[PDB]
C-alpha cells in the first residue's frame, strides 16, 4: 500500500524528475514557414501527437503516479495533458523573448498566430507566461516540480490522500531547491506563491486552447489523431 515516492529525499525527488524529462522533438524539415491555417495547425497537431506519447511515458516516471490505479492515471492525464504541453512550450521559449519555440526548427511569433482564427489570443497568453518565467529566472529544477504538480493537481478534485501527500512532497522539494539556491525565508514563501499562482494562468490557457481545439475539430480541416481526439473528447 505504501508508496515509495514518500520515502525519497528532496535530492532523490529532483533527480528522478530530471531523469524522467522527455526529449525536445523536431517538426517537419520543410523550410516553408507555415502561413496557412492548414499547414500551421497540421504541423502543431503532428508535433502535439508525438509529444503526447512521450508525456504518457514521462508521467509513469513521476514518483507516486504508478501507485495510482490505471483509472486514476487516465483521469489525471486527460485533465492535465494540454496544461503540460503548454508549460513545456513556455519553458522551451523562455530564452527566446517574443518567440514560441514549438520545436528547435519551429520558432513562431504572434504574427503567425494571426493566420489561424482564435490562435493569436492563445499565443499572446503563452508569450506573456514565457516572459514572466524569464523575469523570475525560473530554474529547470523548479520547472520539473511545477510540471509534476500540474499532473497531480489538475484532476484531483474531479475524483485523494496519496495524491495530496505526494503534492506535499513536491512542495517540500521546491522549498528545498530555493533554500539551496540561497533564498531567505521570506523570499522562499513569496517565490513559492508566485510560481503556484502562475499555474492558475496555465489552467486558463489550457481551457481556452481546448475550446480552440474543439472548433478546429468541428471545422474538420486538419485531421486529428485518434489519440488527440480521445484526449480532447475527455473535456466534453
Amino acid at each position: 500500500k505504501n508508496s515509495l515516492a514518500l520515502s525519497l529525499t528532496a535530492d532523490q525527488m529532483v533527480s528522478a524528475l530530471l531523469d524522467a524529462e522527455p526529449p525536445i522533438l523536431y517538426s517537419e524539415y520543410d523550410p516553408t514557414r507555415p502561413f496557412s491555417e492548414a499547414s500551421m495547425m497540421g504541423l502543431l497537431t503532428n508535433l502535439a501527437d508525438r509529444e503526447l506519447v512521450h508525456m504518457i511515458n514521462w508521467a509513469k516516471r513521476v514518483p507516486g503516479f504508478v501507485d495510482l490505479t490505471l483509472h486514476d492515471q487516465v483521469h489525471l492525464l486527460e485533465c492535465a495533458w494540454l496544461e503540460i504541453l503548454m508549460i513545456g512550450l513556455v519553458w522551451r521559449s523562455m530564452e527566446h523573448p517574443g518567440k514560441l519555440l514549438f520545436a528547435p526548427n519551429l520558432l513562431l511569433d504572434r504574427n503567425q498566430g494571426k493566420c489561424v482564427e482564435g490562435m493569436v489570443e492563445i499565443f499572446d497568453m503563452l508569450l506573456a507566461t514565457s516572459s514572466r518565467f524569464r523575469m523570475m529566472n525560473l530554474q529547470g529544477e523548479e520547472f520539473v516540480c511545477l510540471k509534476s504538480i500540474i499532473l497531480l493537481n489538475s484532476g484531483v478534485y474531479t475524483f485523494k490522500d496519496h495524491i495530496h501527500r505526494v503534492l506535499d512532497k513536491i512542495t517540500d522539494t521546491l522549498i528545498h531547491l530555493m533554500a539551496k539556491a540561497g533564498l531567505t525565508l521570506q523570499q522562499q514563501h513569496q517565490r513559492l506563491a508566485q510560481l503556484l499562482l502562475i499555474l492558475s494562468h496555465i489552467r486558463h490557457m489550457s481551457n481556452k486552447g481546448m475550446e480552440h481545439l474543439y472548433s478546429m475539430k468541428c471545422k474538420n480541416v486538419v485531421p486529428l489523431s485518434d489519440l488527440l481526439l480521445e484526449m480532447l473528447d475527455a473535456h466534453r
Partner: peptide
C-alpha cells in the same frame, strides 16, 4: 477501449 489505457500499460 481508450488508446490512453493501452499506452499507460505499454
Amino acid at each position: 477501449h481508450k488508446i490512453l489505457h493501452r499506452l499507460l500499460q505499454e
